[PDB]
């Protein structure tokens, strides 16, 4: 019942209730709680996720020490959630030297050179995305962005990792499509996870009953799906193909190889489509930003020319529109690290087992670093204004050795989708569009109502 930790230390924060802690304050969500705590407590504050003491830091020097400097020795592991089970072998969940092994062995997969070879693969789905969005625009009916971008994101992740050319939108009942679509992003403010946070003693009980956080139906499917394509489909000798090539400390396990595949699908599907939905909302509400972006795409690629690896990186304003969307809408919301030993960083003392939190959303909207944070201004990320942006304040893909391994991959496929979509179409606010768009009160950064926009074809 550790509740007098921040009182003894002299760190401010909200008054905790027995057993529950400060979970009642989450009725507004993770984002609204951090924004309110940052304004009344200041630079450093502490709260309780049931019985778990969580310390939040906002100083850039402290963030650098937690994420970059004292990473390998002190802040190596993330917060342990519900009954993970077999999936404990996944890069994002794995802790200590186990993670070090999986990081080094999976680092050459996300190289700049290997990303060039992945470019023509996701390019064929860019045409498919345009082909599918054409029929939805020809009708004149309102277009649901998450379904269109989701279907695109679904066939992009499956294609990069062994065959599966399957048109996800036109084939919604394919064994691969339907099962991978069931992989729902974990909401940590739902009744299940709230019970796990308040009662951590339930985790060993659920682990012995084989009750897993990840759905049993999909995990059993993907394990046998990966097993058959590795052998039965391609037995003849000449992300999955890159992993088979890798199969100091190697020894890649077949069970671990399955866990890594589920993670790339999980991180790929839900996140890419959610960011792509947020960006198109901002481009429709600001037609001047959309026109300027469409003028830049045509300047680099004349007469609807297909994009390439070197072409994507050349576009300045495209990067500015992506960066400003991720600024206003960081899908991660928070950056957490567990303190393993009693140490002190930049004067501030950190005990043991205390979850060190970095409130990305709150820091991304801090008036001390951003001029008019509520407003969407891509001009912040221009060659002249980019110097003013602190790399430890703006963290959409994190920082240090435990940062996003697929940040270059996610950016590449999102921009490639944006290029094709804006080359052939113009986006305008529909009759039932929420202006201003209000975020969900749950544990997921997504809109309250799905983003619906009227899509007009660029001269059919
Ligand atoms: C819009 C797209 C994405 C965003 C905004 C995003 C964001 C993040 C963030 C904020 C983290 C946490 C880093 C930290 O704790 O400091 C993270 C971790 C990670 N992301 Fe992404 N990510 C995205 C897409 C992806 C994709 C497509 C992949 C896979 C190809 C991926 C794989 C990972 C992995 C494996 C980690 C954990 C790294 C580790 O513990 O070593 N992410 N991502
Ligand atoms: C596939 O299912 C998941 C696996 C790991 C994590 C995540 C997580 C958190 C935040 C994130 F931002 C991402 C993420 C999302 C998209 C791409 N890459 C990483 C994953 N990874 C870890 N270690 N934890 C422990 C936690 F902090 F208690 C809660 N959330 C996470 C989240 C989910 C949904």
Swiss-Prot record:
CDD domains: CYP3A. A cytochrome P450 monooxygenase involved in the metabolism of sterols, steroid hormones, retinoids and fatty acids. Mechanistically, uses molecular oxygen inserting one oxygen atom into a substrate, and reducing the second into a water molecule, with two electrons provided by NADPH via cytochrome P450 reductase (NADPH--hemoprotein reductase). Catalyzes the hydroxylation of carbon-hydrogen bonds. Changing residue 162 to S: In allele CYP3A4*17; exhibits lower turnover numbers for testosterone and chlorpyrifos. Changing residue 158 to S: In allele CYP3A4*16. Polyubiquitinated in the presence of AMFR and UBE2G1 and also STUB1/CHIP and UBE2D1 (in vitro). Changing residue 91 to V: In allele CYP3A4*4; significant decrease in catalytic efficiency. It comes from Homo sapiens. Induction: By drugs, such as rifampicin. It is linked to Vitamin D-dependent rickets 3: An autosomal dominant disorder of vitamin D metabolism resulting in early-onset rickets, reduced serum levels of the vitamin D metabolites 25-hydroxyvitamin D and 1,25-dihydroxyvitamin D, and deficient responsiveness to parent and activated forms of vitamin D. This is Cytochrome P450 3A4. GO terms for molecular function: 1,8-cineole 2-exo-monooxygenase activity; 1-alpha,25-dihydroxyvitamin D3 23-hydroxylase activity; anandamide 11,12 epoxidase activity; anandamide 14,15 epoxidase activity; anandamide 8,9 epoxidase activity; caffeine oxidase activity; enzyme binding; estrogen 16-alpha-hydroxylase activity. One of its GO terms (biological process) is androgen metabolic process. Chimeric transcripts, characterized by CYP3A43 exon 1 joined at canonical splice sites to distinct sets of CYP3A4 exons, have been detected. All are possibly produced by trans-splicing. The chimeric transcripts exist in 3 different combinations: CYP3A43 exon 1 joined in frame to CYP3A4 exons 2-13, CYP3A43 exon 1 joined in frame to CYP3A4 exons 4-13 and CYP3A43 exon 1 joined in frame to CYP3A4 exon 7-13. The longest chimeric isoform (CYP3A43 exon 1 joined to CYP3A4 exons 2-13) exhibits 6-beta-hydroxylase activity, while a shorter isoform (CYP3A43 exon 1 joined to CYP3A4 exons 4-13) does not. Interacts with PGRMC1; the interaction requires PGRMC1 homodimerization.
């Amino acid at each position: 019942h550790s509740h007098g930790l921040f009182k003894k230390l002299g760190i401010p924060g909200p008054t905790p209730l027995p057993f529950l802690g400060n979970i009642l304050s989450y009725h507004k969500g993770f984002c609204m709680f951090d924004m309110e705590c940052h304004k009344k407590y200041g630079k450093v504050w502490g709260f309780y996720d049931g019985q778990q003491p969580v310390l939040a830091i906002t100083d850039p020097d402290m963030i650098k020490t937690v994420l970059v400097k004292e990473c390998y020795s002190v802040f190596t592991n993330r917060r342990p959630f519900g009954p993970v089970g077999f999936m404990k072998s996944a890069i994002s969940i794995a802790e200590d030297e186990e993670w070090k092994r999986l990081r080094s062995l999976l680092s050459p997969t996300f190289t700049s050179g290997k990303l060039k070879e992945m470019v023509p693969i996701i390019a064929q789905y860019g045409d498919v995305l345009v082909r599918n969005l054409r029929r939805e625009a020809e009708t004149g009916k309102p277009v649901t962005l998450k379904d269109v971008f989701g279907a695109y994101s679904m066939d992009v992740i499956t294609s990069t990792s062994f065959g599966v050319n399957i048109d996800s939108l036109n084939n919604p009942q394919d064994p691969f499509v339907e099962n991978t679509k069931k992989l729902l992003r974990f909401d940590f403010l739902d009744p299940f996870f709230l019970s796990i946070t308040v009662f951590p003693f339930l985790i060993p009980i659920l682990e012995v009953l084989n009750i897993c956080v990840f759905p049993r139906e999909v995990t059993n499917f993907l394990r046998k799906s990966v097993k058959r394509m590795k052998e039965s489909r391609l037995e003849d000798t000449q992300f999955l193909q890159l992993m088979i090539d890798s199969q100091s400390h190697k020894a890649l396990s077949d069970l671990e190889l399955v866990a890594q595949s589920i993670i790339f699908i999980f991180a790929g599907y839900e996140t890419t489509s959610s960011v792509l939905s947020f960006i198109m909302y901002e481009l429709a509400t600001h037609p001047d930003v959309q026109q300027k972006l469409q003028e830049e795409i045509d300047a680099v690629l004349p007469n609807k020319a297909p994009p390439t690896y070197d072409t994507v990186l050349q576009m300045e304003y495209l990067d500015m529109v992506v960066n400003e969307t991720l600024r206003l809408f960081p899908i991660a919301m928070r950056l957490e690290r567990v303190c393993k030993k009693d140490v002190e960083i930049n004067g501030m003392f950190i005990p043991k087992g205390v979850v060190v939190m970095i409130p990305s959303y709150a820091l991304h909207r801090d008036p001390k670093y951003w001029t008019e944070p509520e407003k969407f201004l891509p001009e912040r990320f221009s060659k002249k204004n980019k110097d003013n942006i602190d790399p430890y304040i703006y963290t959409p893909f994190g920082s240090g050795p435990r940062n996003c391994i697929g940040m270059r991959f996610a950016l590449m496929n999102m921009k490639l989708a944006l290029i094709r979509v804006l080359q052939n179409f113009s986006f305008k606010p529909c009759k039932e569009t929420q202006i201003p768009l209000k975020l969900s009160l749950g544990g997921l950064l997504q809109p309250e109502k799905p983003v619906v926009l009227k899509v007009e074809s660029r001269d059919g």
